[PDB]
Structures are given as C-alpha cells and as structure tokens.
Write a protein that binds this ligand. Structure first.
Ligand SMILES: [Mg+2]
Ligand SMILES: [Mg+2]
Ligand SMILES: [Mg+2]
Ligand SMILES: [Mg+2]
Ligand SMILES: [Mg+2]
Ligand SMILES: [Mg+2]
Ligand SMILES: [Mg+2]
Ligand SMILES: [Mg+2]
Ligand SMILES: [Mg+2]
Lengths: 77, 119, 176, 136, 48, 79
RNA sequence: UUAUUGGAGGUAGAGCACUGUUUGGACGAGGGGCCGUUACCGAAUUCAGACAAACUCCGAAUGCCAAUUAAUU
RNA sequence: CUGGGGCGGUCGCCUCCUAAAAGGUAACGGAGGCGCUCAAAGGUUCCCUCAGAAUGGUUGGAAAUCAUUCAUAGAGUGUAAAGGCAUAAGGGAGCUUGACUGCGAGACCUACAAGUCGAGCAGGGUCGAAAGACGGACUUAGUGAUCCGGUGGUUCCGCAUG
RNA sequence: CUGGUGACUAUAGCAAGGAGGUCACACCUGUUCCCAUGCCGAACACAGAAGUUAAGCUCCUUAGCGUCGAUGGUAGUCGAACUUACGUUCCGCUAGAGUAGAACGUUGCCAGG
C-alpha cells in the first residue's frame, strides 16, 4: 500500500458482551481499553452489544437482554 | 468467476508495438530479451536475414548457478556481450522485449553495456 | 486471518469433497471485494460525496477511488467526468478481515435482520450484497453521519457456478 | 399508398431504366404471379389501383403479396416556371420495373380466379404482363 | 487561443517569436524557453 | 420565389498516384497524395505531415501488399 | 501505335457485410386487459424476398501511369 | 452572375455526390461546413483499450456508480464531410516547449502571383537507458496582394564634412 | 520434439472434444529490498520454490462458424456492323452470386531434448 494516504489500521478484539465472546480482526476503531490475547501480544478491545453468536437469526435461540437495559428495568418495576 | 490474463500474451502485444519502430540490421543487430518466472534469455538477431548471431541464457549450464534473478540477468548480459564481441559486434539496438526497462531486463542491459556493447 | 485459516483448513476440504475436484487448484476462493457507493446527489452537493468517501474509508481501511460519470445524462443533470461515486477494492488479509467483520459484527446490526438474499448471484459465481445503512458497520458513529446511505459489496470469487459460490459463502458463514 | 417512412435524400437522380430485372424474378411467396414484360416506372398510385382490383375480385379468399415497392422519390417543377433555379419538389414515389420482375403474387385461390384477378390488375399498370406460376 | 503574442528574450530583449494564446485562459504574460539566435542558446522568453 | 441553397464546392486537390510502379524516381519525389494512409510508407519511403508518400532515396517504385487489407509503396535502389 | 509485364483506382454489374429504405413469415425477455395464457410483444433473435448518385462483403470491360523491353511508325 | 432584364439568391475558402474505377471536368445541379480552437487538445517516454448487451447490486429508475461474461469496432478521434486511425492517429500519467534558428537535394500543383510535400546538413535543445522521436494538432478549411503608416532590431545609407 | 525469434492475404482463425507437467512455460508463496496501485503487491516490480496440471500454454481430432475456392454458365463491357428499338448481331475481355472442392497452417535462424 501507499504511504500516508490510508487511515490508521491496527488489530482489535471485537468482544460481544452478551456472550463474552472475543474475535480478533483488523479495524480502525482504536478503543482505549486493552486486553490480552492467546498470542503474547495485547490488542485493544471493541465492545459489541450483538454479534454472530448472539443474534437470534444466527444462533437459532432467543437473545438475552443485557443488564441495566429497558427489559431489565421494566421487570424491576 | 474472474479470468486471469496471460502475461506472456500481454507482453507480446507490447513487444509488437516496440518492434514496429525497433529492428535489427547486420551492422546494428537487435539484442532481444525474453523473461520467464525463473530465467532470462538474450539473443542477437539480424532482422534483414532473420538469423540469430549470438545467444545466452540464465538457464545455460555455463551461467546457471544459485543467485538472484537480477544477478543472473547481469551474468547473461556479460555473456551475450562477450559472445557478440567475439563475433565482431559492437553497435546494437536493445529490444526490451515488451518488458519494462527495469529490474532484471535493466540489469542485463547494463551488464552488456559495461561488457562493452555500444548501444 | 481467522477466516483465511478457516478457508484453508475446513472450507477447502468440505468444498473439495462436495464437488469432487481432481486438483486443489480447482477449489474456489474469494478473489476480491469491491465496496461501491453511488452518490448521484453529489451533482447538487459535493459535500455529500465527501462525507460518503470519509465513511467508506473508515469502513474499509483504505482510501477510496472516486468514480466519475462515464457519460453525460441530461435527466440526471450529470456531466461527463463529475465524481458521482466511491469504490474500494479489498484483496488478501484486508479482504478477509472485512468479510469476517461484515459477517459477524456488521450484518446482525440490521434492524429486523432475516438473512441476506440467496439469489443475489450474477450467474457466474459472484455475489452482490446491497446494504441499506452505513450505520450497520461498527466503525461509524451515528452522531457524525450527516446522511444515511447504502453500499454495494461485490464479492468476486473464482467459482464457475452459483452453486459453488453459495457453498463457499455458506462455509464462510453467510446467512441466507 | 406505399412510400418510405423516410429517406436520406428526397431529391434523387432518376433511376436507370435500361437493362433487365436484377432480381425478384420468381414467384417465391404465393402460387401465382404477375410478371412484367416491358419496362416502366411504377407509381404508388398504380400499385394501389392494381392491388384493389385484384383483391376485390379475389373477395378476401386468398392472400396477395406486393413484390415491388416505390423507394424512389421523383420531383416536379411548379407550373409555368423557366428552367433553372434549383431542383423541384417531390411529386411522388415510384418503383422501376424491368422485364422479368414479379409485380404481385397470389395464393389461396384456384388458378382461374388468380388469372382473372391478375388480368384486372394488369389493366391498371403501365407495363405489359404475363401470368406466371411457381417454377420447378 | 484568441490573441497574438510577441515573445521577447529576457536576456537580450530581442522579439524572436510570435504565437497565440487565449486571453481568458492565460491572462498573464506567458513565458517559455525558446532558442535565442543572438545568444545562440535557449533563454526564457516572455510575452511583451 | 425560387433559389438554391446549394452551389458550393472546394477546389479539387489532385490526389492519387504521382509515379508508377517500376518507374525510377529521385530522392524526395512524391509518390502518392492522399487523405489518411490509404497507402502506407514502405521501405525508403516517408509520410509527410499531410499523409503524402515520398521517396527517401533514388530508386525504383514498387507498390506492394501490406497484410490482407492494406498496401504500401517502397523504393529500392537499382543495382 | 501495338505486343508483353507491373501498378494506382471503386465505375458497369452485382451484393446486402456496414448506413439507410423495404415485403411476407417464425419465435418471443418481459411485463400488462386475462385466469396464468387467443391484443401489444413495441425488445432481441431468426427464415425467405427486394431498393440506393452521396450504401459496399465484392468488382469488371475500358481508360491511365510506367518498363536499360520488342515490332511498325 | 442571371435560361431577357428587374426582384429574389449568389460572390472567398473546405468536404462529399454529380464525375463516366488515374487526374481534371459544367449548370441559379444534390448535400453540408469555414472566417476558429487548444498552453495542451503540442513534443517525448511509459502504460492502457472501446460502444453496447445480459446477469446480480441501495438511495438508482430503461439509462448515473460497482461486478462478471459476451462484445472487432457499431466507441472515440476539438470542429463539416471524406479518407484514415484498435500495433492506434483513440485513452491515462511523468517530464517538457521542436507550436526551434539558418536552410533545403528533390517533388506535387500551377497562366501568373501564389499554394503543397520534402529527405538531409549545421547550430542549440526536449523526452528517452538506448535506438531514436520532435521545425505544432489523424489528414484536408480557420484567410487578403501592393501602396502607405506604426513598433522593435540593425558590424547598411547619411546630398561639402561630423 | 520443446522453446525463443522472424516470414507469409485466417488454407494459419473460432468452436467443440481429448491428452501433458526431472527439465522448461505457467499457475503458485510472499512484500525485506529496487519498483508500483488516481484505492488495491489484482497489475507492474522484486524475492522465492511448499503446492498443482485446475486454468493459461503446447499437442491431437473434426468442417458446426469464419477463411480460401474453381470449371461451366450468366451480368457488364472495349471494338465492329446494323439501328432509334427501355435496342439487335459479331468478336475479344469477362464478373458478383452460387456449385464442386481446399483447409484445423507452411516455413527461416538460434538454443536445448
Ligand atoms: Mg473535392
Ligand atoms: Mg501537420
Ligand atoms: Mg449499379
Ligand atoms: Mg428563355
Ligand atoms: Mg475515368
Ligand atoms: Mg476521378
Ligand atoms: Mg486529436
Ligand atoms: Mg552630411
Ligand atoms: Mg467468383
């Protein structure tokens, strides 16, 4: 690739918080949070509300509402 | 489904366009270069008669060895220059074969120049 | 390169066994991914095209090529040479990263998602997916999105048939 | 009234009329045909007159084909002008007919009916004609 | 191009060449290298 | 009343061959005046800015086939 | 002048490959009135048949330019 | 000029047909263009190949942009037509100013005056590794004699001499 | 026989079917280096040799398309005689279309086998 034209690119771990499922891939989201990975190096983490392993269409199961959500507050009521 | 182009065919179209304007004479024969994924070949051709005068390839046992392709191109240039000088040829026109004048082709040409072929 | 490793290990073997290829060189692979955004309203406001280019660059990771009108059209008020689109070509590791990201992080963010069209094959082993909201992609913050616009993602494969392309994309994990 | 929907040139040199029929000299669509034996210009109006005569006699029973078409515009000067000052305006449209050309063809009727229909047609045309059958 | 132009050598001043330019496209005094016979060399000429 | 809007034509340019196949010509002789390359320059023949074909050497004119559809003219020195 | 040999060139004729003109069919990507099926199929394709100074896939007779050319003049 | 004259039209230049397969060839015959444009739309080096259709794809529809396949030229070539051009004369980029100075064997055209083509030599350059290409533009219109006057240059003259 | 590089109006091409891979040609593995992409190491360039004949490429078969193509006859026509007839006759030349048929190349130089 040419130098100085492309946006900054780096490895990141997308973490589906619903299932606490982590997947490594490149992106340019540059989250401050850092986490360790099975390889010795550590890369920043991108929080993700819904993912392939959590979406109902992909999974075949009903999705689980997250904490502090609308459903949780409604049930607390 | 996406096709893959034939690099040699593209190369040959370019070479034909080069050769409309570039041709080799008995006094100033054409130094032609052919390049493969592994080897590089050089000929000296008189186009009026359609006869080769000298030949040298990186695939030849005399030149064949373990070296980078650019070093092998240098060796082929030196060899073809020496054989042309032995046959009594100084002035030639360099036919880059439709390849860009760069890298291996360029190294071969510069080797021939240094070996004493006058372009 | 998790997706590339999956292709090398599992998808290759599955597809080869399914289609009885005498040689490994017959195994289809995803040649490239072209992400195109056609901005016809750039005729009226070039800033829209600039924003589209910025968003596409953020999504893809590399600077897009600006595509200009091939011919002049009176009805669209389009003059030849006016930039009316953006396009990015992804190959290799960047392509695979974008593909897995699209499959996993991006696609499920579609409201009322029910899978992607299984008939969106050109007829020769290439698949075109029409996304309708840039906001799908994780790299874009809805605050900075002045306008919402879609994209065409063309996955160009070496498969000679729609059946083989479908098998390859399914093994990769494409919903349908 | 036949005439081309358009032409590139409205003012054209008048066609050569010597020689023999270049083509279309055989019955190829119907069973019977009307063959020109002398040379003439044939106008759109003459074609229409002849077609009406033969079709009316055939009483819609059979099928008619017009094998000639008036491609060629011809001009005429306005009345009472001197020579010169440019070529005149298009007056009509004509097909050139030479000996051997089939003018009309008919099918779907008896030979006798075809003969009478084509006789009635021939009296509308400025050329001599003969009744012809498909050759073999 | 829509106006005639005289190019004068910027070293000796000789008006060596005439040419043409579009005045709306090139409102400035155009300059270019041209051969100067008096000096027997290429010099920068510019529109008078 | 009546007039023609026609009545114009440009001067004829005397194009075509100016020397015959087999004829001896001196260097510089025009061999063929043309628009475009209806005929191509062959050996020892040049093509001027207006497509005129002219001889570069003294010699014999020869009109020759050039491939399947094209043709050229060449000039060859006499022994 | 003739004989022989070479060459330039697009006419006569012819043809429809291009640009246009044009007659009968076949078939129909697709939607509409129609339930699937009895218009338009205006698209595309295809068969057969025609027209052209400013059409040409072809192409004469002649005429023309030449030849260390022969005969007659 | 004029199928009497007037009135109308026309008057120079380019392309095509008429034009009878070299060239030339008329009419108040049939059709159109010109009185420019471009600082790149010129030079050179390197690279590239179209129009259209089918099938998929969002805003996008018959046509915008993307992708594959087919597609030999139906595109493009500043501008009329014709002849050419896909070994490009078409398209893109880098560097450039040969859109040079002195000329010019030979040739076309031709009543004259003019008009056109031109290898090659010398000087000093541009691009190219080099061979080499370049004295504008794919080609053919885009123009006006002399006299007189203006401006710049000039180892020319200067009415006894300076 | 294979390759490189030439010559020849496709009789050489297209299409379809089949065969091949110490070496060679490829696809192929990568982007440190020279070099590159109006984005993309796709391409160009370079480094390299794990994999594959799948494709390219080469070779073999054929006559579906394209190409070539008579003889015979016809159109046209130079010249001559007669004629005024949208003409006739005689002589020479002689198409286009179509038919038979040809054809899935022929060859020069160089280096390897
Ligand atoms: Mg003319
Ligand atoms: Mg010129
Ligand atoms: Mg004719
Ligand atoms: Mg009178
Ligand atoms: Mg003549
Ligand atoms: Mg003529
Ligand atoms: Mg141009
Ligand atoms: Mg004095
Ligand atoms: Mg024949």
């Amino acid at each position: 690739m040419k130098q100085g034209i492309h946006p900054e690119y780096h490895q990141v771990i997308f973490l589906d918080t619903t299932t606490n499922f982590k997947f490594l891939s490149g992106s340019t989201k540059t989250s401050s949070e850092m986490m360790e990975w099975e390889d010795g190096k550590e890369y920043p983490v991108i929080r993700l509300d819904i993912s392939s392993d959590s979406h109902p269409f992909y999974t075949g199961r009903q999705k689980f509402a997250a904490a502090d959500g609308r459903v949780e507050r409604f049930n607390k009521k | 489904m996406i096709s893959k182009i034939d690099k040699n065919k593209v190369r040959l179209k370019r070479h034909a366009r080069v050769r409309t304007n570039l041709s080799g004479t008995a006094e100033k024969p054409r130094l032609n270069v052919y390049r493969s994924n592994k080897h590089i070949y050089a000929q000296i051709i008189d186009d009026n008669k359609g006869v080769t005068l000298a030949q040298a390839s990186s695939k030849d046992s005399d030149i064949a060895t373990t070296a980078t392709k650019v070093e092998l191109a240098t060796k082929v240039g030196e060899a073809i220059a020496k054989k042309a000088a032995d046959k009594g040829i100084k002035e030639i026109v360099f036919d880059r074969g439709g390849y860009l004048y760069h890298g291996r082709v360029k190294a071969l040409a510069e080797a021939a120049r240094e070996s004493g072929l006058e372009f | 390169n998790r997706l590339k490793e999956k292709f090398n290990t599992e998808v290759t073997e599955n597809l080869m066994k399914k289609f009885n290829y005498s040689s490994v060189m017959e195994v289809p692979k995803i040649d490239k991914i072209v992400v195109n955004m056609g901005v016809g309203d750039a005729v009226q406001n070039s800033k829209v095209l600039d924003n589209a280019v910025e968003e596409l660059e953020l999504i893809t990771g590399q600077k897009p090529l600006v595509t200009k009108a091939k011919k002049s059209i009176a009805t669209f008020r389009l003059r030849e040479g006016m930039p009316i689109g953006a396009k990015v070509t992804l190959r290799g590791e960047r392509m695979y990263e974008f593909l897995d990201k699209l499959i996993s992080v991006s696609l499920p963010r579609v409201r009322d998602f029910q899978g992607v069209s299984k008939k969106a094959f050109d007829g020769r082993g290439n698949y075109t997916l029409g996304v309708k909201e840039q906001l799908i992609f994780p790299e874009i913050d809805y605050d900075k999105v002045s306008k919402v616009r879609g994209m065409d993602i063309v996955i160009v494969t070496t498969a000679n048939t729609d059946e083989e392309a479908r098998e390859l994309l399914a093994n990769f994990g494409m919903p349908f | 009234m036949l005439l081309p929907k358009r032409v590139k040139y409205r003012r054209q040199h008048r066609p050569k009329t010597t020689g023999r029929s270049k083509g279309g000299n055989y019955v190829t669509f119907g069973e019977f045909g009307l063959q020109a034996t002398t040379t003439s210009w044939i106008t759109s109006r003459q074609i229409e007159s002849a077609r009406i005569a033969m079709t009316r006699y055939m009483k819609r029973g059979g099928k008619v084909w017009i094998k000639i078409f008036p491609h060629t515009p011809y001009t005429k000067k306005p009345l009472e002008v001197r020579m010169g000052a440019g070529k005149g305006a298009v007056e009509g449209w004509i097909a050139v007919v030479k000996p051997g050309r089939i003018l009309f063809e008919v099918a779907g009727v008896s030979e006798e009916v075809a003969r009478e229909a084509l006789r009635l047609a021939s009296h509308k045309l400025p050329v001599k004609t003969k009744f012809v059958k498909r050759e073999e | 191009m829509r106006v005639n132009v005289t190019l004068a050598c910027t070293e000796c001043g000789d008006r060596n060449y005439i040419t043409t330019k579009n005045k709306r496209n090139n409102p400035e005094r155009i300059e270019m290298k041209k051969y100067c016979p008096r000096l027997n060399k290429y010099t920068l000429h510019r529109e008078t | 009343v009546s007039s023609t809007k026609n009545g114009r034509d440009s001067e004829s340019k005397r194009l075509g061959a100016k020397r015959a196949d087999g004829q001896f010509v001196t260097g510089g002789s025009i061999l063929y005046r043309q628009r475009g390359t209806k005929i191509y320059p062959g050996e020892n023949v040049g093509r001027g800015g207006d497509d005129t074909l002219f001889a570069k050497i003294d010699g014999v004119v020869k009109f020759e086939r050039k491939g399947r559809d094209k043709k050229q003219v060449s000039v060859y020195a006499v022994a």
